[PDB]
Write a protein that binds this ligand. Structure first.
Ligand SMILES: *[C@@H]1O[C@H](CO)[C@@H](O[C@@H]2O[C@H](CO)[C@@H](O[C@@H]3O[C@H](CO)[C@@H](O)[C@H](O[C@H]4O[C@H](CO)[C@@H](O)[C@H](O)[C@@H]4O)[C@@H]3O)[C@H](O)[C@H]2NC(C)=O)[C@H](O)[C@H]1NC(C)=O
Ligand SMILES: *[C@@H]1O[C@H](CO)[C@@H](O[C@@H]2O[C@H](CO)[C@@H](O[C@@H]3O[C@H](CO)[C@@H](O)[C@H](O[C@H]4O[C@H](CO)[C@@H](O)[C@H](O)[C@@H]4O)[C@@H]3O)[C@H](O)[C@H]2NC(C)=O)[C@H](O)[C@H]1NC(C)=O
Ligand SMILES: *[C@@H]1O[C@H](CO)[C@@H](O[C@@H]2O[C@H](CO)[C@@H](O)[C@H](O)[C@H]2NC(C)=O)[C@H](O)[C@H]1NC(C)=O
Ligand SMILES: *[C@@H]1O[C@H](CO)[C@@H](O[C@@H]2O[C@H](CO)[C@@H](O)[C@H](O)[C@H]2NC(C)=O)[C@H](O)[C@H]1NC(C)=O
Ligand SMILES: *[C@@H]1O[C@H](CO)[C@@H](O[C@@H]2O[C@H](CO)[C@@H](O)[C@H](O)[C@H]2NC(C)=O)[C@H](O)[C@H]1NC(C)=O
Ligand SMILES: *[C@@H]1O[C@H](CO)[C@@H](O[C@@H]2O[C@H](CO)[C@@H](O)[C@H](O)[C@H]2NC(C)=O)[C@H](O)[C@H]1NC(C)=O
Ligand SMILES: O=C(O)CC[C@H](CP(=O)(O)Cc1ccc(I)cc1)C(=O)O
Ligand SMILES: O=C(O)CC[C@H](CP(=O)(O)Cc1ccc(I)cc1)C(=O)O
Ligand SMILES: *[C@@H]1O[C@H](CO)[C@@H](O)[C@H](O)[C@H]1NC(C)=O
Ligand SMILES: *[C@@H]1O[C@H](CO)[C@@H](O)[C@H](O)[C@H]1NC(C)=O
Ligand SMILES: *[C@@H]1O[C@H](CO)[C@@H](O)[C@H](O)[C@H]1NC(C)=O
Ligand SMILES: *[C@@H]1O[C@H](CO)[C@@H](O)[C@H](O)[C@H]1NC(C)=O
Ligand SMILES: *[C@@H]1O[C@H](CO)[C@@H](O)[C@H](O)[C@H]1NC(C)=O
Ligand SMILES: *[C@@H]1O[C@H](CO)[C@@H](O)[C@H](O)[C@H]1NC(C)=O
Ligand SMILES: *[C@@H]1O[C@H](CO)[C@@H](O)[C@H](O)[C@H]1NC(C)=O
Ligand SMILES: *[C@@H]1O[C@H](CO)[C@@H](O)[C@H](O)[C@H]1NC(C)=O
Ligand SMILES: [Ca+2]
Ligand SMILES: [Ca+2]
Ligand SMILES: [Cl-]
Ligand SMILES: [Cl-]
Ligand SMILES: [Zn+2]
Ligand SMILES: [Zn+2]
Ligand SMILES: [Zn+2]
Ligand SMILES: [Zn+2]
Lengths: 682, 682
């Protein structure tokens, strides 16, 4: 039973897998990551799973030229390079003889050597640019922008810069965002040194997966787009730097002063916006290449005893920018011990009711490529058989409390499960995870319950949830800016053991939460989804988008913009979902059981519109999508939200409001249609 | 049991329903068709079905202006109308006091009064135009074209004319295509009189349904496209005429002579191609309007006893251009008696295993609007629950032999069923339908078996099969040019009773074929689909498209165009489908049964690509689509076919061949993926 599963998980095992996964870099497309995949495949076979396979794809990746390093320069009038940025990060103690630490670089930057004047754009958010162009009347065209990391996904920053006319982007880590007060730099604390740099891709894929093969798996016979038709690639060069290098670039900044304090970091510089310094310019040198490279997912199967054609999936990535001490090996080590523990019951003669699939995804760091291509290959099986997807990237971002993001269909399952688990928090010994989680992170929606956020993107659940409509969830420990050492060489096992989780108790709790969700999904007779929870949030989301529109009362009058159809649909959903729940509590018959479970499994599916959202065909869920301004954040009724965004600035109001009304219709229709899936079937 | 069902069907009942359905016109959007829908709904309730509902939609229809008739004129230099075409068809005997016979018109023609010189374009097929432009070097730009009806759907003719620069189209019925030798004109035989005209829509919808609401049902709150963004509407005026009127227009034709005999009809005219006569011109007067009008489908439910969440659908249209004696009431009367007969067993305490839905669709004549909108509304239920769709338009086109078009998944079911039925054919008394059907219509694919054709479009199965991937089939009696009186006022009950089927025995046989297919689908424990039949045709289709490409050996060398991946996939499908069939013959367990039946139900589904075919998003089946040159005809591997079509004429070969190779990949992938749905599930 579940307790047997849960008691078998050990903090010590997790510790030792983490150690094992973090001694050398495991960059996607490298032989080191192929050999770690082969290791995981033998171990999962030894641990007891029925079959364990590699699935490979040939996808577009990006790497620096080893003989031709990327860097940025201040040049004087004569064209002399008077300051050059660092070529690599100072390695941490004990790691100086490690080969193949990829130098800091922005994956998928095009090649180039632009020189120009700098403008400073704060976080390069959509609103940052509005301020610059609209309020300050600064023009970024033909300028190189420098922007600090933080707040939004880096790909969005680059997209906004490109839209604004920039010809280069420089990203840096500001100590105000990546240096927590009162703690030391690595290795004596967990802060980012002035020499540390954040690697990361800067694509704008919008769910496409491999840039060359949107819609279709990048297998051996795949037809590939030419690079100039590739999806999501940036057209201006980009590179990241540490804050010692950044101070040199910013210290000379002239032109206009920062519009306000929100624009100032914590370096000793004026944070002037530019443009320009006075005869000195900036010059970038980027020589990275894009190359089609083979990647490898590991797929493990534990066959269900009763419904082997019903799939519960636990997945997370294995590739890392360098050592991956938190991101992702802290998640991967937890998956490994969950597989061990399931395989232990299996060996005692137990099987789950439903089939469980376990995945170690490749190339997540380069745009969720491994998960996406596998799902493109297997989409028919997933869509008619996929019960749920539980993600398993990093178990920790912090040591304060639990963080859960999921579909409303799982809200009750998580509430129940966390009441059965003990808190590991200091001061809550003998109290439940639910109790500590809800004191420390209370819902702002109401009640004596914990906050649960919306799924956005930036992780491997995206294809499952936003493209295919499979109920998905994730959980990890978090802090009270992500963590300072994110994607730097300094993110090591030692960082985790010394400063995050010395006793591996937080890891163990996250392993219990993830493992328990999976166990219930795979073995409970009736699926543990509550459709009434979707009815409640649909109403809150409708109220919200309604409020946004009501900022424009005159336009709503002129163009007759009614939300009545959406509210009607949400009422209908609320009433039908109540009746189904009654029927759920009132039946005996396995065909009936299977019919009702199918109704539950398909309800997430019902929110998918096969035409997709406007200009984003692979985002097909009508209720949720990644924010168009920040891939990491979820937005509700995305179609209507984006139609209303900045609408006072469009030239043809009647066309713009026409499209608002069209999206209201699409939403109202899709809510009604989803509701009807829960009606009596004949 | 089945025999009980089949014995309950009566030829006499069919006769009397036909009579009842054909005494007044039932044009879509008219009150007469609404009242026939209300009648059908009460009767189906009385006949015993569990529930019977109307589903309504507000869709774009088209009607002539009652105070401003459409016509064509020869005008002299002074602008005098020296000849005018007929304003209505001479009514048949006994029908002269019937109100509301819509005059001959091309539904959805735009308004206009173009005058110009005539070019004669034969059937206005794609190859007709190639001949004119390429061989004969005639330019149709700014000309009015006149084309005879036949060979291809009329919408295609209009699309080709429009592409060729025409500014008007005149369609006529040539006696060579609509006057069978040795038989008299109505009312003394079944031929078309010189005064008869073929009504019909001329849209190019490509599966969109209602022109204003592609993707979404045209319900009460629907957001509608403006007419200028409407899908599928023609941009040049169009009108049809009889052959007495046509002779007047053709008799004066000058310019170039017909390129060959295939271009000559059976009128006493030279069939000169034009352009022009000599100072006389042609002038059209079209004043028809498009209007959003409510339509009504009748939906009947007979709940399944064991799997009520599995839907077998029998459907056909009810709307007619005028009386609808063959098209569609000859089908509708057969559905009515099938419903009576099922409801009779129901009343004796019987239920089918699976739910049966019965539909009387509206507005089929105006572009399959009623079926399409209902499926757009219910697409989630259909896609996860839809076992099969059996269409039921006209039961007869002729009195010679059976004609069946269906997915290969039903080939065995139809072979078996027709061996259990008696032939009604003269000279085959005491022999089986299978025997008569296969002597008279032998497969050209090989064997001592009957011909079964591919599904194309031009009927209500299109949304079910090509958009949603639900296994579909149809059957009717046919002739050894469709039937002469198609869509004219002369298509009456009397036509059927006197000349087609005096004893209603052909009707009864078609009722047995349709009814029996439905009965087996709804009640058999294991679904009566044979996946090995799909493996055999996939190989034939691959050979075929391969042969087409091999007309271009040099290009295949230069661009490296290999079909190896498609042949590999078809081999894989063949082998996996064999194993599944073995497993199908070897299991006991209802979850197992339900899993295997789901694998069978989903196999048609697997051929759907959610991105659709190029430039046709609502045609999503990769194996079949309506021919791009003739909506009535099915084409196999449509994506590759169209990429190869006329490819020697494209300007950039490497791009054109690139796209061939892309479609080979898409096909090969989709066959492999469909195959994998029939693999062991874990
Ligand atoms: C939520 O569920 C409810 C059912 O509980 C569902 O209610 C439906 O609302 C529609 C309106 O959107 C009703 O439609 C009416 O049907 C009758 C039938 O004759 C017509 O009389 C009405 O049309 C008249 O009025 C119209 C107003 O302009 C005219 O245009 C029209 O020509 C007629 O004069 C109208 O069609 C429908 O009957 C109910 N269904 C019920 C209660 O059976 C509601 O739509 C659901 N919400 C959503 C978003 O789906
Ligand atoms: C029909 O089903 C069969 C299985 O019965 C399936 O066979 C598969 O074919 C692919 C080739 O398309 C095989 O792929 C190989 O896998 C090995 C693993 O290391 C590689 O060595 C091969 O790659 C080498 O050669 C390549 C050639 O260019 C190089 O590019 C590459 O870098 C390597 O040098 C290749 O990937 C695959 O293993 C089999 N599967 C089996 C038998 O397990 C076939 O593809 C199916 N047909 C379709 C259309 O799906
Ligand atoms: C991580 O753990 C694994 C397995 O416990 C180690 O891999 C094994 O290494 C030994 C000795 O080199 C070999 O004999 C085995 O074949 C390996 N087993 C495999 C690949 O499953 C591995 O060396 C550990 N890595 C580190 C850095 O400690
Ligand atoms: C979470 O737990 C609660 C309490 O056990 C469950 O709610 C009960 O479910 C049982 C079993 O069907 C009912 O008899 C009770 O009436 C329910 N109490 C309620 C409605 O508060 C709930 O089902 C659980 N949710 C899951 C497992 O998803
Ligand atoms: C077609 O058949 C139907 C039903 O047998 C006839 O409709 C009925 O007509 C009678 C007399 O007018 C009414 O009392 C009933 O209410 C009708 N029943 C219905 C609508 O179900 C109908 O008149 C026949 N039509 C023709 C042209 O013969
Ligand atoms: C059509 O009928 C044939 C002959 O009855 C069926 O083929 C047999 O099916 C039975 C039942 O499973 C097997 O035991 C035999 O070996 C089959 N004979 C063969 C393969 O020729 C066939 O299943 C029927 N097809 C249907 C119902 O779709
Ligand atoms: O291409 C993407 O969508 C995101 C790629 C990658 C995903 P990640 O694995 O690093 C996200 C992440 C960040 C912090 C933590 I703790 C866990 C996961 C990123 O650069 O954001
Ligand atoms: O819009 C369409 O796709 C077709 C509409 C209509 C369909 P139909 O019902 O008349 C097709 C048809 C023709 C002959 C016969 I016998 C049965 C059915 C047509 O004009 O072709
Ligand atoms: C690295 O840079 C130089 C100059 O082109 C050369 O060694 C080689 O071309 C580069 N490697 C690449 C582009 O893969
Ligand atoms: C920057 O690097 C370039 C290229 O190696 C070199 O010419 C220049 O002197 C360097 N500048 C400094 C200040 O080291
Ligand atoms: C930004 O400057 C460029 C330089 O030519 C100009 O063309 C562009 O329109 C400017 N942005 C504004 C003010 O529209
Ligand atoms: C771990 O827990 C303590 C207790 O609040 C906290 O102060 C410390 O900063 C935490 N570690 C990290 C890296 O957040
Ligand atoms: C029919 O034609 C005339 C002229 O416009 C007039 O009676 C009326 O406008 C027309 N009806 C329409 C366009 O619906
Ligand atoms: C054709 O009809 C028009 C409009 O009614 C009329 O002016 C003309 O005389 C008619 N021609 C003939 C030959 O009847
Ligand atoms: C057909 O004639 C028109 C009339 O201007 C011309 O422009 C067009 O190009 C012609 N077709 C050919 C020969 O391309
Ligand atoms: C009905 O059957 C006879 C026998 O062959 C045939 O000659 C006759 O033309 C048929 N009727 C029609 C309308 O085809
Ligand atoms: Ca792909
Ligand atoms: Ca529609
Ligand atoms: Cl996660
Ligand atoms: Cl039919
Ligand atoms: Zn990462
Ligand atoms: Zn990660
Ligand atoms: Zn018709
Ligand atoms: Zn018809």
């Amino acid at each position: 039973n579940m307790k047997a599963f849960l008691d078998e998980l050990k903090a010590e095992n997790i510790k030792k897998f983490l150690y094992n996964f973090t001694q050398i870099p495991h960059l996607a497309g490298t032989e080191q990551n192929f050999q770690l995949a082969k290791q995981i495949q033998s171990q999962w076979k030894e641990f007891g799973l029925d079959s364990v396979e590699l699935a490979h794809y040939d996808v577009l990746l990006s790497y620096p030229n080893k003989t031709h390093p990327n860097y940025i320069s201040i040049i004087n009038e004569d064209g002399n390079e008077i300051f050059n940025t660092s070529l690599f990060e100072p390695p941490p103690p004990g790691y100086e003889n490690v080969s193949d630490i990829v130098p800091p670089f922005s994956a998928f930057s095009p090649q180039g050597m632009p020189e120009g004047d700098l403008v400073y754009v704060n976080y390069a958010r959509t609103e940052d640019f509005f301020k610059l162009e609209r309020d300050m009347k600064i023009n970024c065209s033909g300028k190189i922008v420098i922007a600090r990391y933080g707040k939004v996904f880096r790909g969005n920053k680059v997209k906004n810069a490109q839209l604004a006319g920039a010809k280069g982007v420089i990203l840096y880590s500001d100590p105000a965002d990546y240096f927590a007060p009162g703690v030391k730099s690595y290795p004596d604390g967990w802060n980012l040194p002035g020499g540390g740099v954040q690697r990361g891709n800067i694509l704008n894929l919008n769910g496409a997966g491999d840039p060359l093969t949107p819609g279709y798996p990048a297998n051996e016979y795949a037809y590939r787009r030419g690079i100039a038709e590739a999806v999501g690639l940036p057209s201006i060069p980009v590179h990241p730097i540490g804050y010692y290098d950044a101070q040199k670039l910013l210290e000379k900044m002239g032109g206009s002063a920062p519009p306000d304090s929100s624009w100032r970091g914590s370096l000793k510089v004026p944070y002037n916006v530019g443009p320009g310094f006075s005869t000195q310019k900036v010059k970038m040198h980027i020589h990275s290449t894009n190359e089609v490279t083979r990647i490898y997912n590991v797929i493990g199967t534990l066959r269900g005893a009763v419904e082997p054609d019903r799939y519960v999936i636990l997945g997370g990535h294995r590739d890392s920018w360098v050592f991956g001490g938190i991101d992702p090996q802290s998640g991967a080590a937890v998956v490994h011990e969950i597989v061990r523990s399931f395989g232990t019951l299996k060996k005692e003669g137990w099987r789950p009711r439903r089939t469980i699939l376990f995945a170690s995804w490749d190339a997540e760091e380069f745009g969720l490529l491994g998960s996406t291509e596998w799902a493109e290959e297997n989409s028919r099986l997933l869509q008619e058989r996929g019960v749920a997807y539980i993600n398993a990237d990093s178990s920790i971002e912090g040591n304060y409390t639990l963080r859960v993001d999921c579909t409303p269909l799982m809200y009750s399952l998580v509430h129940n499960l966390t009441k059965e688990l003990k808190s590991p928090d200091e001061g809550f010994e003998g109290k439940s995870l639910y109790e500590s989680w809800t004191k420390k992170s209370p819902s702002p929606e109401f009640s004596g319950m914990p906050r649960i956020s919306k799924l956005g993107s930036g992780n491997d659940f995206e294809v499952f949830f936003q493209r295919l409509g499979i109920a998905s969830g994730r959980a990890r420990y978090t802090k009270n800016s992500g963590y300072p050492l994110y994607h730097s060489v300094y993110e090591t096992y030692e960082l985790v053991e010394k400063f995050y989780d010395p006793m591996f108790k937080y890891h163990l709790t996250v392993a219990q939460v993830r493992g328990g969700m999976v166990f219930e999904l795979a073995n409970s007779i009736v699926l543990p989804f509550d459709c009434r929870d979707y009815a409640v949030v649909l109403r809150k989301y409708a109220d919200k988008i309604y409020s946004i529109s009501m900022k424009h009362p005159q336009e709503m009058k002129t163009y007759s913009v009614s939300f009545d159809s959406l509210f009607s649909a949400v009422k209908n959903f609320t009433e039908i979902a109540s009746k189904f729940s009654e029927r759920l509590q009132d039946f005996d018959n396995p065909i009936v059981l299977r019919m009702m479970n199918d109704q539950l499994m398909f309800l997430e599916r019902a929110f998918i519109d096969p035409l997709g959202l406007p200009d984003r065909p692979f985002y097909r869920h009508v209720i949720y999508a990644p924010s168009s301004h920040n891939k990491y954040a979820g937005e509700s009724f995305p179609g209507i939200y984006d139609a209303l965004f900045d609408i006072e600035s469009k030239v043809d109001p009647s066309k713009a409001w026409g499209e608002v009304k069209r999206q209201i219709y699409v939403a109202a229709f899709t809510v009604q249609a989803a509701a009807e899936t829960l009606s009596e079937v004949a």
